[PDB]
Symmetry: C4
Subunit: 327 residues, 4 copies
């Protein structure tokens, strides 16, 4: 009963249930050649959603993504490109959601991407220093300038998203259409309980990230930090600490149990976890991450697992995770 393509929240934008992100990898961990191969595989398998941010690899991720698009020559109308704005430089005024940085930041991102506009521009996080009205007006401005088709939020509380909505309706500006939130077996509350309320009330869609908890859900950290794994990269000590933390080891324990279910279904753990993220219609799309083609092809294979996620399998997983949120 899976619909590979679905509307992003209550908007007319149709996105593939799986998208491909560029955090850590593009312009950073992987070569541009590998990046080109991964994007081609995604596109060829129906994926039309690609996410990035001005902050990724100090702008390099956008340059690489833009180069691939130009090199491959795919029709712009067949792509859904999203980018996030917030961290755009070391200067005081090069960060935040002020009208100045939203305009300067997106303009710079578009230049790096070699694109006239992105399909969705997201505030990468909330800005306690900028009044909602200014941010909503600025987002509306860039959309009206043809620099973006839609705008959205990321890591905003449901109250903040509703505040953006309130401002849009009070001053007749454009309402946000999507919230890019973390979602995986170890982070469920927001996406499973709060976001559905926003969907029904104001049509905001949910585009989720880190479906494997940065690779942790793959289960390859079962016995330490594998050489060259994300957690071993420079600038990712924070990920390593989480993995080696007491709770991180408790997560691995549960993964072992989940691993059993995977085998019982005939799929890998990552495939189980990703398919799990797409089990409810509440999620419009899950953004994937991959450092090589084997991972990406494996991940995309999650779609075949979906039909096997019976209410029985779901309850089993909840029993193991023991973190089913309260409705």
């Amino acid at each position: 009963m899976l619909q590979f393509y679905r509307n992003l929240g209550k908007s007319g934008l149709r996105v593939s249930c799986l998208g491909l992100g560029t955090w850590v990898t593009f312009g950073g961990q992987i070569t541009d050649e590998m990046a080109e191969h991964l994007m081609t595989l995604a596109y060829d398998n129906g994926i039309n959603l690609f996410d990035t941010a001005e902050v990724y690899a100090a702008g390099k991720a956008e340059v690489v993504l833009g180069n691939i698009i130009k090199k491959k020559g795919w029709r712009r109308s067949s792509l859904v490109i999203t980018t996030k704005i917030f961290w755009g430089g070391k200067a005081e005024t090069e960060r935040g959601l002020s009208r100045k940085h939203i305009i300067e930041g997106l303009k710079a991102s578009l230049e790096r991407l070699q694109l006239e506009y992105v399909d969705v521009v997201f505030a990468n996080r909330p800005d306690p220093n900028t009044p909602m009205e200014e941010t909503v007006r600025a987002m509306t401005h860039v959309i009206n300038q043809g620099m973006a088709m839609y705008w959205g939020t990321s890591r905003w509380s449901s109250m903040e998203i509703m505040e953006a909505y309130s401002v849009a309706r009070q001053f007749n500006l454009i309402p946000p259409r999507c919230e890019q939130a973390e979602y995986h077996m170890f982070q469920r509350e927001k996406v499973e309980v709060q976001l559905p309320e926003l969907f029904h009330k104001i049509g905001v869609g949910a585009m989720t990230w880190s479906p494997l908890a940065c690779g942790i859900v793959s289960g390859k950290y079962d016995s330490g930090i594998p050489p060259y794994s994300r957690a071993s990269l420079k600038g990712y000590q924070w990920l390593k600490d989480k993995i080696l933390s007491e709770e991180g080891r408790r997560q691995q324990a549960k993964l072992k149990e989940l691993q059993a279910i995977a085998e019982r279904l005939g799929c890998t753990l990552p495939q189980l976890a990703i398919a799990w993220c797409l089990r409810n219609e509440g999620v419009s799309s899950v953004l994937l991450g991959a450092s090589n083609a084997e991972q990406l092809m494996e991940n995309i294979g999650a779609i075949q697992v979906l039909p096997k996620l019976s209410s029985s399998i779901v309850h089993e997983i909840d029993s193991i995770l023991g973190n089913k949120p309260y409705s």
Copy 2:
């Protein structure tokens, strides 16, 4: 009492009571040379309205229409060019009335047409996947961007048109100005009963299409499918089936009776049918279709039949058709 030129609904746009469409013919069934001749004949006879769509001949119709305009060099201000948006490609995001496709679609159409803007951009059909607000805001955006002067609907129910109006008035956007609907002796309800209500309530005008039911009303299918008739073209099996269907044969029977009236008036059947479509002021313009110059000149001749359409002749036609709608 006929006014060759009239306002399109309650707008300041003046259109000829007859327009020339490009479906099937331009960039497809006929040569560009024939297309040039037909458009010249139309223009020289006072017709200022020419309709097309991004979907016609996969974009070729717009290219041909644009070439003729450029070659003939007619003043842009003396022309009323309309195009329809909805089917713009095979990719998921290349169809519909989302802000993304409305903007990308019209931009591409304008490029093919070699025009800076169209006079009216129509949604080719309703989009159940896009909220009215998004569509109305997008139409408003392209008008404000100078890509179109006005926008309209096509094949929308009167309720959907009123919904577009509701959205425009609630958010202070631009209301639709015209509905391009099917109208001929065998399809009367919507145009004769519903559209007049929209005209009086919200000033929406009626621009009708397929006045000869794709050629069926010409009566040339009286004894089968004539070689090279539209119904015999590739990709038009649907038309042939309708003609050969039980109801299609019942239509021909009535045509024979109508044919009698035509002769009694001194005009052809097509001329009778077209003049019939223009008998009421409710219709702003009737879009013609033609594969050769004889047909077009014949069709334009319908204007001379108008004065002969007495209340008596109209009642006779209703008696024959037996499908006069209930008011």
Copy 3:
């Protein structure tokens, strides 16, 4: 107590109490050389307001006005250029106040003028075929597009001007700022009674035209139609008929009486009539017309007569004219 410069109605635009028009003369009756001399004289004497229209000499007036500006090289910021839109071609859609013609017409005028924008764009007359909302939205659009700084009306009734205002306030569009109306000793009602109401109620200013009734007030038609006078030009039979009409001869009779007052004041009749037009603050500026430098210099001299227009002189003139409107 005369202020040579004043605000145009309740707007921040400062115009000279005298302006120079281009009807009949520019690109038509006079040579471009004479036109250049007249504009230079005006500008050098403090006049910053120059009026034209897309219809004058089929566009030639705008070309000449634009050439002079470019040749003389005056700063654009030191000029107030106004043009009027309505009659822009022979095609059906090349006339009126529809969104299509307002945009196409002003764009064409700007091209002829070699200017990026006019200070004020006026509807040359009312358009019974275009809803007020469409016209007001179109005027607002060109102002927002930077093609004009302000918009106004011409030959509109006070009710129609208030209707434009109603539409602007209901849909949050831009209100009109000036009405260009006929004003001279033989046409007083509208400017003396109605326009002041609009000034106080909605801040609309009054820019008047034909201060000499096309030359009639000069008194040179006292004994027939002087060779080469405007009334003798081709396409101006209408003016000649008015002059030779019964009422036209009755006007000359009164002019003779006025002539006496002029001599008593030490000024010419035209100077008396023009100064008369500027006697009340209700008029922001009077648009002058001239076919040679003697006339223009004479007319500008009207400013010196102003101080001599005592309440006694005004009553005398009213007694002679016998057409003082009722308040």
Copy 4:
């Protein structure tokens, strides 16, 4: 507890607590070489705010400021450039806050600055000849045109600023974000009593000017007009008169007393006065003025004095000045 960077009023724009102005100096009193050195020193010390005006040195100040930016090549996103509009030429229409001059003036300023936009455009003073609605709409227009990020007022009464706010909320336009007001030990009322009310009520910020009262607070006029001091420059007789006026001599007397406190703190008088201006959070930034590098470096040193401004020191200063406003 000082935060070097702070929000400009309730906006997301972050400005350094100290800014560098260009009045008198740039393109005028100092060489472009000196101007370059001063701006570099400011920038290198964290200052991101630079103020100018179309009227300064008849446009030359903007040319010099723009040249330095281009020569130094600093990222535009790391700078906050503000300019003021009002006096833009000798022609009648080249001054004021009409839509015409706001657009023409800022366009010309941007051209001189070699910039696409300024961060904040200020009305240099109030315009009694232009209705608030026109000014607010024009400011909104240039912001929407991408010529400025924000707009503000200068030398406007708190009532006039609230009027601009009223207009913005009534017609859904953009509200002003900052008031550039005079602030120093001899001019305190407005900034200390009125502006805080506007901050809390409508989020307007306070950017202050002439922190040394044009150099008077430096105390170098203790015994006359020093050669080459601002007060001795051509076109600044007004400053000299103030200094030599009875009240001006009374100010010097108090400066002598303040001088004592400075020495007691281990700082210069200018440093004491500038730090004094930044003692309250009500002031977002203080615009500095300097004719040489010694002054600028001295002034910037005011930041170190801040921590020494105890409630005791403040009361002492108030006792000396004797002009503490009433709350």
